Amino acid sequence: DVVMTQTPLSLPVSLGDQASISCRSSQSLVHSNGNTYLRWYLQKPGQSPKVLIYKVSNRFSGVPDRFSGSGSGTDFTLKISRVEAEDLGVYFCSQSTHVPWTFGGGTKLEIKRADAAPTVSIFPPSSEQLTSGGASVVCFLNNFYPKDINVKWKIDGSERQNGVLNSWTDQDSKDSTYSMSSTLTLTKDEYERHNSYTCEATHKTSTSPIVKSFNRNEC
Amino acid sequence: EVKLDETGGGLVQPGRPMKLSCVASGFTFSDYWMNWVRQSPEKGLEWVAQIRNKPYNYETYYSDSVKGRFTISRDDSSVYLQMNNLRVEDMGIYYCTGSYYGMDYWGQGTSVTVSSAKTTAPSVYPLAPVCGDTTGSSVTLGCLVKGYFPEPVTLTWNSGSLSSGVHTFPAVLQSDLYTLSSSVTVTSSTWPSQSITCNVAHPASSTKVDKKIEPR
Ligand SMILES: O=C(O)c1ccccc1-c1c2ccc(=O)cc-2oc2cc(O)ccc12
Predict the structure, then answer these.
(1) Angle ∠(A20,A25,A28) on CA atoms, nearest 5
(2) In order of start, what are the domains of chain A with their CATH numbers?
(3) For residue B97, how far is its CA from the centre of ligand 1 (angstroms)?
(4) Which residues surround ligand 1 with Cβ inside 6 Å?
(5) Which residues neighbour B32 within 8 Å (Cβ) at sequence distance 6 or greater?
(6) Does A176 touch chain B (CB under 8 A)?
(7) Which of A24, A181, B53, B161 shows the smallest number of beta carbons within 10 Å?
């Protein structure tokens, strides 16, 4: 099991910028036969990985000349000379010298933009849902940048783990921001035993958590 | 002009098996090594199994994790993968690859869903701004689509007239059933002055719901 470590995991760039991505193997990629079987792949959303580079530095037919691979032994580099829109995706390196064949974790190529704090909205359970014996508390954290963010659920000031469902959007085409959905699901019984429900988000944009709260009794 | 087109995916109750078929269509099938690779719900690309050729005495290799349960085979044209004893952890997208002198060609992929769940219609709920209080210039509304199965729901805002300011979050599997949510940001001029309706479809259970967002 050769370990392919890929760096960085996310690479913000502006269109026309040059980008470089690295890959390290645990063991040497040099096959007894003399070949170095290291491949570079690009996966655009909704499609399958397509190889760009094979055997370190051979560019597959039809791949733009703006892509080039280099390295030897256990250190490999992928280089894009002028980032275009159609270049955005996830890039993987993979070795095929040793069984089992293995892959790196991916590097996402995304647009660079100014930091923007999340706009947080909190939503108590709807009447229709309580009527069913369930109570879902929802929090939207919209249009923020960078993507990194932590969300904490607090009930009567104590932290709640269990029953949280998080979902994230992909970088927005228009503005380059990300959005996130955090839903805490409780039983109607539980929701009626507690009063204070809070959504607290930690983001680089601010030193202190972004808090959004509601009191059930005040509903 | 290398072509790989896999087939044979769907739902599978765990413990149960399934058979994946890939017909390699634009090369000397005999000269290439064939492979099965899968991609898990996240960032996890995984090499599953390998079937070599004559020269390499049709050796067969398999990843730790499917060893004794899956069989790669070839029809010198096509390659098959017999998936037996399907667990949840084997849920992912499955791609067929043709390998040759360092190069690799991938097909389209086939999704393999492993779940006990049966077809269940979603519960759609209106998400109105806070317990009759503070919100409204520009107000944010939402719609919650809870516990449906399988895979596909469609959510629209005002029958698709209102497209801007909406965010639709990818569905996530909450212990055998999916949940989806969507937000729409309007202006205080607009709501509740106007009508804001969440439209949801779940073709598989024949559901078509329209939920109006009313001031809570
Ligand atoms: O690289 C070859 O000599 C080769 C030729 C035709 C078919 C397969 C291979 C091939 C390998 C052949 C022998 C071997 O010891 C290792 C090979 O690794 C390969 C890795 C690939 O990605 C892709 C292909 C190979």
Answers:
(1) 125
(2) 1-113 (2.60.40.10), 114-219 (2.60.40.10)
(3) 13
(4) A 31, 33, 35, 37, 96; B 33, 99-102, 104
(5) B24, B53, B98, B99, B100
(6) no
(7) B161
